[PDB]
Write a structure and sequence with these properties.
Chain G: One of its GO terms (biological process) is chromatin organization. Chain G: Keywords: Acetylation, Chromosomal rearrangement, Chromosome, Citrullination, Disease variant, DNA-binding, Hydroxylation, Intellectual disability, Isopeptide bond, Methylation, Nucleosome core, Nucleus, Phosphoprotein, Ubl conjugation. This is part of a larger assembly, with 2 copies of chain A (94 residues), 2 copies of chain B, 2 copies of chain C and 2 copies of chain D (98 residues). Chain A is 73% helix and 4% strand. Chain A has 94 residues and is mainly alpha-helical. Chain A has one domain: Histone, subunit A (Orthogonal Bundle), CATH 1.10.20. Chain C contains 5 helices and 3 strands. Chain D has a single domain, classed as Histone, subunit A, CATH 1.10.20.10. Chain D contains 4 helices and 1 strand. Classes of the chains: A mainly alpha (94), B mainly alpha (80), C mainly alpha (108), D mainly alpha (98). Chains in contact: A-B, A-C, A-G, B-C, B-D, B-E, C-D, C-F, D-H, E-F, E-G, F-G, F-H, G-H. β1 of chain G pairs parallel with β2 of chain H, so a sheet runs across the interface.
C-alpha cells in the first residue's frame, strides 16, 4: 500500500481551463510534474535564504514575493506578483 | 573492450547534422569519443556514489537525475 | 461544525493550498510558516503552468494535432524569451532541437 | 547517372534530423559502454532501464550543444569544415577544460 | 555592540603549525574566513540533501563523508576522508 | 568533574562545539549526530592547512614573511585540484597569473 | 540627478584592462562595445542588490547585499564578508 | 634621430607590468558616479557604503579581465592578433550570456 502524490489532476484542471478541448500525453504530464517541483524548490530555497539573512524565523508572504522578484524576469515577475497579491487579498477578505 | 567504437562514425555524423554542421573533418570522431567518455565517467561516478550511500546495488533513474542536477544539467522527464 | 469549504476554493485557485502548506512545513525551510505563504506560492505556480500550457497548446494545434507531446513543450519553451531564459539550463527528454541552419551554409 | 553536388544531401540531412526527436545512437552499444565504464568504480552493479535511458538522453543533448558551439567557432575562422581545434576552443571557453 | 564571531584564531593556530615563523595580513585573514564559511555551507547543504533523499531525519558521519566525496576532487577527497575518519576514531576511542 | 573540550578529545584545532551549534541553528535537519561536527571540523582544518602551506611557500618564494591575498591567488591558481574546487571565485586584490600567448611574442 | 557617466570609463582604462588580459593589439571599435557590456553587467547586479535592500526595509546598500547578489549570479567573491 | 620603439614592444612591456600588479585599473570617482546613476534608475534616494562600491568595482574588473582573455583566444583562433568586436560577441555567445 505505497502511494505516490503528484500534481497531475491540478495540471489537468489548468489545461481544461486554458484549452477546453485539448488533451495531453503521459510523458508531457511527467515533464509538467518535473517543472512544478523544480520551480517550487527554487522559490522555497530562495525564501529560506532571505529569512536567514534577516535573522527572521518565519516565512511570510514578503519572503515569497521577494523570491519571486529575484527569480523570474520582467513580464513573468510582474504578472506573478500581481496574481499572488490578488490571491492573498481574496483569501484574507473571505 | 573497445566499447567506445560502439559509437560508430555514422552516429556521430547524425549527431553533428542535428547540430547544424554541414562538413566534418576526418579527425573529429576520435575527439568526440574522448569528450563523450569524459562526460560519461564524470556522471557515472556520482551516480554510483549516490547509489552506494543508500546501500543499494541497483542504479536507479533518480540517482542519475541527482548526479546530473549536481553538474548543473537538470533533466526533466525521469522524475518518477 | 459547518461545511468544510477548503482553502484553494477560498483563494479561487485550482492548485492545492494545503499540500503546499504541508510541503513547506516538512521541507525544513524555516521553523514557522505564515498563512498567506502557501496561497501566494500556489497562485504563482498555477500562473506559470497556465502560461506554459497555453503556449504548448498553440504549438500542438499549429502542427494539426490535438494532444500535447514533449516536442510541443520544447517548441513552446525555446521560442519564448522569458521562458527560454528561465529554463535555459534544462533538458527535456524526447524534445529535440529548434530547426535552424546558419545562413553561410546555404547554397548560392 | 544522377548525382547530387557535394553538400546537397548534407542540408537535406540537416533538415531531416532537426525536424525529428529520435535518439541517434543505437541502444545496445551505449548500454555496453555504460556498463564497461561503471565497471571501474564498483563491480557487479545493476541498472534499471530508465537509468540508461536517462544517461543516453543527457549524453545526446550534451553532444548536440557542443556541436553547435563548434560550428560557431568554425564559421568564425571563415570555414565550413569543423576541426578538432574548434571543439577545443569551444570547450576551453565553456570552462570544461579550464 | 553585539559581538562578531570568526575563525581568525583557529586559522592562526593552523598557520603557526605549518609555517612556524610566517605571519598573515588582515585582508588575507578575511579571505580565509570567507573561504571557511563557503566550504562549510557547501558541505552542510549537500549533507542535508542526502539526508532528505533517503527519508532520514539525522545528519551523521556517513552523510558528511558522502558530501565530502561528492564535492572534493581526487587527492583532496581521499585525504580529507582519511583525516576525518582518523579524527572520529580518535574521538570515540577516548 | 574536570572538563576537557571536544576538539581536544578529537585532536583538532578547529572548534567542534561551534560547528555543532552552526549545524543545529542552520536548519539543515531536525536532528544532528555526535560525529558529524567532528568529521566536518577535521575536513575544514585539513583544507585550510593545505591552502595555507601553498600560500606560505609562495610568500617565501617572493622573499616575504607575511602572506597577502596575492599569495593566496598564486597558490590557488597554480594547483589543479584547488583551482578546480575554487574555479568560480574572485579573490579581492589578487590579480592574475603571468601568462602571454606564444604567438604574440616577437620573432 | 546625474546623467551620461559611462564615458568616465576612458579609453586608457579599457586599454589597461585589456593589457592585464594579455591582449596585444586593440581595434578602434572595441571601446564602445566594451562599455555596453559593462553596463549590462552592473544593471544585473545592482538590481538584485536593491531587491535585497528594500526587503530589509533599509535605505542604504551594504556590501553584504552586493556579495549576495554576486553569489546568486554564480560570481562568488571573497574578501568583503 | 630620436629613439622610438617598434610597434608591439611597449605593448608587451605593459602586459608584463599589468600582469605583475594587483591595483585597480579604473578611477574610483567615475565608477562611483556610474553606479549611482544606474541605482537611481532602479530606486530613488538610495545610499551606499564605501565597501559596497569597492566590491562592485572588484567584481566588474574581474569580469572584464576574464572576458578579454576569452576574446584574445577567439582572435588568435582566426589567425589574427588584433581583437575586434565580433570576437567579444563570439565569446559572450559561447559562454551563454547573450
Amino acid at each position: 500500500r505505497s502511494r505516490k502524490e503528484s500534481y497531475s489532476v491540478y495540471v489537468y484542471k489548468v489545461l481544461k481551463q486554458v484549452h477546453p478541448d485539448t488533451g495531453i500525453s503521459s510523458k508531457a504530464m511527467g515533464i509538467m510534474n518535473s517543472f512544478v517541483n523544480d520551480i517550487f524548490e527554487r522559490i522555497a530555497g530562495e525564501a529560506s535564504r532571505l529569512a536567514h539573512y534577516n535573522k527572521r524565523s518565519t516565512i511570510t508572504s514578503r519572503e515569497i514575493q521577494t523570491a519571486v522578484r529575484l527569480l523570474l524576469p520582467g513580464e513573468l515577475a510582474k504578472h506573478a506578483v500581481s496574481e499572488g497579491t490578488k490571491a492573498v487579498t481574496k483569501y484574507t477578505s473571505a | 573492450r573497445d566499447n567506445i567504437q560502439g559509437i560508430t562514425k555514422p552516429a556521430i555524423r547524425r549527431l553533428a547534422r542535428r547540430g547544424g554542421v554541414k562538413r566534418i573533418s576526418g579527425l573529429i570522431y576520435e575527439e568526440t569519443r574522448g569528450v563523450l567518455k569524459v562526460f560519461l565517467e564524470n556522471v557515472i561516478r556520482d551516480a554510483v556514489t549516490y547509489t552506494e550511500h543508500a546501500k543499494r546495488k541497483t542504479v536507479t533513474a533518480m540517482d542519475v537525475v541527482y548526479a546530473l542536477k549536481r553538474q548543473g544539467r537538470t533533466l526533466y522527464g525521469f522524475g518518477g | 461544525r459547518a461545511k468544510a469549504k477548503t482553502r484553494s476554493s477560498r483563494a479561487g485557485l485550482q492548485f492545492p493550498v494545503g499540500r503546499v502548506h504541508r510541503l513547506l512545513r516538512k521541507g525544513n525551510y524555516s521553523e514557522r510558516v505564515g498563512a498567506g505563504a502557501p496561497v501566494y506560492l500556489a497562485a504563482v505556480l498555477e500562473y506559470l503552468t497556465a502560461e506554459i500550457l497555453e503556449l504548448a497548446g498553440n504549438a500542438a494545434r499549429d502542427n494539426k494535432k490535438t494532444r500535447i507531446i514533449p516536442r510541443h513543450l520544447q517548441l513552446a519553451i525555446r521560442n519564448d524569451e522569458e521562458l527560454n531564459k528561465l529554463l535555459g539550463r534544462v533538458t527535456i527528454a524526447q524534445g529535440g532541437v529548434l530547426p535552424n541552419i546558419q545562413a553561410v551554409l546555404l547554397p548560392k | 547517372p544522377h548525382r547530387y553536388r557535394p553538400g546537397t544531401v548534407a542540408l537535406r540531412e540537416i533538415r531531416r534530423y532537426q525536424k525529428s526527436t529520435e535518439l541517434l545512437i543505437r541502444k545496445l552499444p551505449f548500454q555496453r559502454l555504460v556498463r564497461e565504464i561503471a565497471q571501474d568504480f564498483k563491480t557487479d552493479l545493476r541498472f534499471q532501464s530508465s537509468a540508461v535511458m536517462a544517461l543516453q538522453e543527457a549524453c545526446e543533448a550534451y553532444l548536440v550543444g557542443l556541436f553547435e558551439d563548434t560550428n560557431l567557432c568554425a564559421i568564425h575562422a571563415k570555414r565550413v569544415t569543423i576541426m578538432p581545434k574548434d571543439i577545443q576552443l569551444a570547450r576551453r571557453i565553456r570552462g570544461e577544460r579550464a
